[PDB]
Amino acid sequence: ANFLVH
Amino acid sequence: ANFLVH
Amino acid sequence: ANFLVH
Amino acid sequence: ANFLVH
Amino acid sequence: ANFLVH
Amino acid sequence: ANFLVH
Amino acid sequence: ANFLVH
Amino acid sequence: ANFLVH
Amino acid sequence: ANFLVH
Amino acid sequence: ANFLVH
Numbered sequence: 001a002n003f004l005v006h
Numbered sequence: 007a008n009f010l011v012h
Numbered sequence: 013a014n015f016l017v018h
Numbered sequence: 019a020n021f022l023v024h
Numbered sequence: 025a026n027f028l029v030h
Numbered sequence: 031a032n033f034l035v036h
Numbered sequence: 037a038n039f040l041v042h
Numbered sequence: 043a044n045f046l047v048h
Numbered sequence: 049a050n051f052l053v054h
Numbered sequence: 055a056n057f058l059v060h
Contacts, residue, residue: 005018005024006012007014007031011024011030014020020026020031026043030035030042034046035042038055039051042047045057047054054059 001014002008003016004010005016007020009016009022009033011018011022011035015022017023022028022033024030024035025037026031027038028033028040028045030047032044036048037049038043040045040047040057041053042059043055047059050055052057052059
């Protein structure tokens, strides 16, 4: 899984 | 898993 | 399981 | 399990 | 298990 | 797992 | 287990 | 595991 | 186990 | 494991 929170 | 929090 | 809380 | 709390 | 608390 | 917190 | 508290 | 806290 | 408290 | 706290 990939998580990106800007 | 990859986590990136900006 | 993956948990991310911003 | 992975836990990330920002 | 991995724990990261910011 | 990879964790990056900016 | 890995623990990181910032 | 890799941890980076900026 | 690895523990890091900042 | 690798830990870097800036």
